[PDB]
Design a protein around this ligand. Structure first.
Ligand SMILES: NC(=O)CC[C@H](N)C(=O)O
Ligand SMILES: NC(=O)CC[C@H](N)C(=O)O
Ligand SMILES: NC(=O)CC[C@H](N)C(=O)O
Ligand SMILES: [Mg+2]
Ligand SMILES: [Mg+2]
Ligand SMILES: [Mg+2]
Ligand SMILES: [Mg+2]
Ligand SMILES: [Mg+2]
Ligand SMILES: [Mg+2]
Lengths: 441, 10, 441, 441, 10, 10, 10, 10
């Protein structure tokens, strides 16, 4: 951990000249306020004011005044600063009256964690799986369509393909303070998944944001381009953000039950049932972009139906074989483009709602591949995820459970942002249309 | 089920 | 008109060497069987066989055998053939047993006209308004993205821009036996419109097909590219195929009523009501392509809501000021990419269904622009057209009135074709997505 | 050997930062899970989970969970890592319940060795002879069609042709802990061979995998391309992986018999008979690719008939003149593209099946070249190896002995992989067809 | 409205 | 089935 | 109203 | 026979 005196001590010792007061907007973009080291005491006293309306994105209507409350445990010094050291602090947004801002995603996740603690669950242990594509750049340094390499699943190439720009990333992350579990080449060519050890939900989301920033910076250093776009290319695998979750009550895994046939407690089953019930509502948050629903197509391991299994091609919820203190529920819908705080908040809230109402877990899907007709699917009660952003937004609006998780202020602005994005997308005339038509008609 | 995996031939 | 002996006489006199036995598939494409002049008598005896499964398009499963029954009244000799004269005949498709093929669009329109005659309506008088764009070609002869001119609505640029490759099209059509009303420059740059005099439904559809073919050929002659794409460019007006319809009973316009305030008979009002209720079901036929629904966006004079008005920005049904024998109902949803036979058939069937059930015409919309909220729109009972091809297909399947107009055989194949098209479209990753994302994520 | 404490000691001493947990899939490709040195203890505790379905290749249907059990004796530190040292460990695949995975090739070889030990044979001593080609690269770093040199059998070109990037490979392997016997230029231009000393079967296969990886890396360093393709060029010699085998029972060679005329025990003769009878069934494993059967053509020293001799053009089985403790049975079918574990497993299982049933050794083939007609060949009872991958797969399916060696799980996935490969190959239109035809027809 | 009409300025 | 027919999209 | 911020689509 | 051996003349 750290204290004010500790932060000042390292800042003086490390010759830190500039401090980034980092926060996140509703779209997951990393925003910051740059600060000279002479203002560190003022920042640590929670006295820095900024717009605060920058959270709303491009739909902000009026300028507000809001305070940054830095989290001392998030202090870190970037390694690539070299000459003039730059540090960062992750801050919470507070209204001038003293109450936290209802539109801050970190505050939303904290509030959902608090109402979870109200049920006796001390912590939510989360381990994500953020995969990214490494593309080549041109003379101006713009992302091309060529991948850095043409490797496969767990492929080994010590030259500069399987690993390539990954060893340096892992080294940098570990130096900063990231507990890296393992790294490997993903199914699609030019995909390298780096995994971290499990942490608490807020720490996990902070680590996701920092990981994305670090990966982008290091890839740019090597003359490459790193993207967390859910589906950058047609016909190849997309990028997911499978989230492994387990609720804890005083370092006891409440999901574990040795007496159960699957080693799953009734609490875990209620959690999974709650997540399954509200999946179509959370789809707009865990899959927020238009491109997110080009990944949710059959044949590329991405989930397309709301179902759970212990072994299947692509279930919505997968339960890993690990048991004991590491029994987990893996949700595979989210893509790395999702806001980590909002995604974790809505998933936790859906699980807690399932726990509250004691929902009944539907039967798991067997090796029965979904080649079955739609009549078979709705006869067996297997729902499907939304086909595009519009359906997800409609389900989000109609939902009363996870809209409460978002809150009244954030829901309206998120809906406005996504509605504008969809409206801009739907009126475009794409090159595919000009290829099919313009000669036939 | 397996189509994106068969990209090595394509 | 023409007879067998007449056709043989002109063929010998005009030195016709090759004859095109033209027909149309379910997608509106013009197909033909080329025939040497020595086979003219065999063709006129209704004895030529061909696949017939080519009507189904790319979803054809088995080869059939079918006869071509040429329509002698459709005989015409192309003027650009020069050395070796080429003529054409439009043929109907008949099964070997002698009955007409149920999947032939021309036969579908003929059957709907027959069941209209069963109600006492001798003919359906149709005048279409097809619009097209002219694009400049490159050295290889492929269309570029640059329009041939930059004119406006009813503009006049005599040199090479205003008329350009429009005067010769009108001249060639006039030599072909067409009755051209007028031509003018359209709203969007490079967009032109040529209007024909009104004719019976089958003749109108044949003229639409011939007009598209002739316009394409003449534009290719002048080093240009003519397209009937509904929306070739974003941000400019699209191309529509407004259809003016009036039912007739022995040279009497049954839509006319001098005693009525608007000069509209109860039959016309029932016709309009029937067209209005079945609008969303017909949308998949009158707007058959994916690009068709990029035109149906507000602000470009294309209709977006199911409503009628004598004077409005974008009404689905417009009633021109002409009265007497020229009182008409104008339907503006169809685009030139639609199949003329199928579009006319479904519109006539919807109108006849309105007539049969004495359907009540909803109140016309005033100058009230649709800036009103969705709550105001569904409070006033104003339906909206489908937002994409998928919704239109779902409505098509759900409808029992115009699916009967299509028939059992044609409906299944059209639905298969359109599902395949939509499925290939929805999984593409467009350049717009790579522009928005791939840097922000 | 090594222990946990030893591994930790060298890892701390050598400044090893990254560890590769290497394993092999059914196609022989080297796969790995990269690991930071901070996870070394966790890896050594056999607690690392991974997909495990990556063994199946591109025909994997569902994600599993498997543990990596590193083999401490396989520890080595790569010499080219320089700045950040990278080490590797070869691991076995275990199911979460604790039992070994049935689809792991290394486990398959271990199981066959165990059932060999059940008959009293303590070890199986194997010496392979892998050959490879060196190709010049282009500016982009892709292999061209030009060989690195034009030498012949046992040629000597000191400057840049004879040894070149072969002396360095031997030096690096020696530093890596290999026991190299000799190296020489092969028959075809650009073809080289490096021989290791004999080792136990598992160690031999591990050394084959490491040797291929090291050769490829070092060739890439010298601006060359190293390939183990069975027949990269038409009209020149292919590359084989002759395997010398001898069974041992308490450091006594059971193949040796001083009283025998050829110095061959009855056990050795039964072994050879068993290998001969099951040759066509093993061909799909020892010659797994489509290109493997372009090597098995007459006139290039590759075997084409199932027969044994002490001196011949190209027998399936050759018996070297060495006697005593070095009496060996050399099988010449395998090519370097084969999976070493699977190939050794099937060869050993066939030999053990021959031993169990006291199979009768057919007469050796004399200097009688196979210019004899097919009637002479089937009159003398000389079988022929499969002509392509399809025949080999059919023989593999029909076999009940070596299919048991593979096991039920691995057999199905290997068959699926090879069936897909053959199906993709057989429908291609090659340039040879366009050269022969497209003008004559 | 009049989006395609105002294209002369755009 | 209909492999060469669907070549318009390919 | 928010045209200045909507420049990302333009 | 000796096809790849006689490659020096070819
Ligand atoms: N786990 C994998 O094999 C990759 C998952 C896949 N990339 C997805 O988008 O879900
Ligand atoms: N003036 C007009 O009516 C133009 C109509 C417009 N071109 C359309 O597509 O509907
Ligand atoms: N041993 C040699 O002379 C070379 C053998 C040959 N390369 C083969 O593939 O069998
Ligand atoms: Mg993954
Ligand atoms: Mg996962
Ligand atoms: Mg017009
Ligand atoms: Mg009009
Ligand atoms: Mg050799
Ligand atoms: Mg040898």
């Amino acid at each position: 951990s750290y204290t004010r005196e500790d932060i000042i001590r390292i800042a003086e010792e490390e010759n830190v000249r500039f401090i980034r007061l980092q926060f996140t907007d509703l779209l997951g973009t990393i925003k910051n306020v740059e600060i000279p080291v002479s203002q560190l005491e003022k920042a640590l006293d929670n006295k820095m004011m900024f717009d605060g309306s920058s959270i709303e994105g491009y739909v902000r209507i009026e300028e507000s005044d809001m305070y940054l409350y830095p989290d001392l445990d998030t202090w870190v010094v970037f390694p690539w600063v070299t000459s003039d050291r730059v540090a960062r602090l992750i801050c919470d947004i507070y209204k001038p009256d003293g109450s936290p801002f209802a539109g801050d995603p970190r505050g939303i996740l904290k509030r959902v964690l608090k109402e979870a603690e109200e049920l006796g669950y001390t912590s939510m242990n989360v381990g994500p799986e953020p995969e990214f594509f490494l593309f080549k750049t041109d003379e101006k340094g713009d992302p091309t369509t060529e991948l850095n390499d043409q490797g496969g699943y767990f492929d080994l190439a010590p030259m500069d393909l399987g690993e390539n720009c990954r060893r340096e990333i892992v080294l940098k992350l570990e130096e900063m303070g990231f507990e890296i579990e393992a790294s490997h080449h993903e199914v699609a060519p030019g995909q390298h998944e780096i995994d971290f050890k499990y942490a608490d939900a807020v720490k996990a989301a902070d680590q996701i944001q920092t990981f994305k920033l670090v990966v982008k910076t290091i890839a740019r250093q090597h003359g490459l381009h790193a993207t967390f776009m859910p589906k950058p290319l047609f016909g190849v695998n997309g990028s997911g953000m499978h989230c492994n979750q387990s609720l804890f009550k005083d370092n006891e895994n409440v999901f574990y039950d040795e007496t159960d046939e699957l080693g799953l407690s009734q609490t875990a089953r209620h959690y999974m049932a709650g997540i399954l019930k509200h999946a179509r509502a959370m789809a707009a948050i865990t899959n927020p972009t238009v491109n997110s629903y080009k990944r949710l197509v059959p044949g590329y391991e991405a989930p397309c139906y709301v179902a759970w299994s212990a072994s299947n091609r692509s279930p919505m919820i997968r339960i890993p074989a690990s048991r004991g203190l590491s029994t987990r529920v893996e949700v595979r819908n989210p893509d790395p483009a999702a806001n980590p705080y909002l995604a974790l908040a809505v998933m936790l809230r859906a699980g807690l709602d399932g726990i509250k109402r004691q929902m009944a877990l539907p039967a798991p899907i067997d090796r029965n591949i979904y080649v079955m007709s739609e009549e078979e699917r709705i006869e067996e009660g297997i729902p499907s995820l939304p086909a595009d952003l519009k359906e997800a937004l409609s389900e989000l609006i109609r939902s009363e459970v996870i809209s409460d998780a978002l809150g009244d202020h954030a829901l309206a602005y998120f809906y406005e942002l996504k509605e504008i994005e969809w409206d801009m997308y739907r009126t475009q005339v794409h090159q595919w249309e000009r290829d099919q038509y313009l000669t036939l008609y | 089920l397996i189509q994106g995996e068969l990209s090595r031939f394509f």
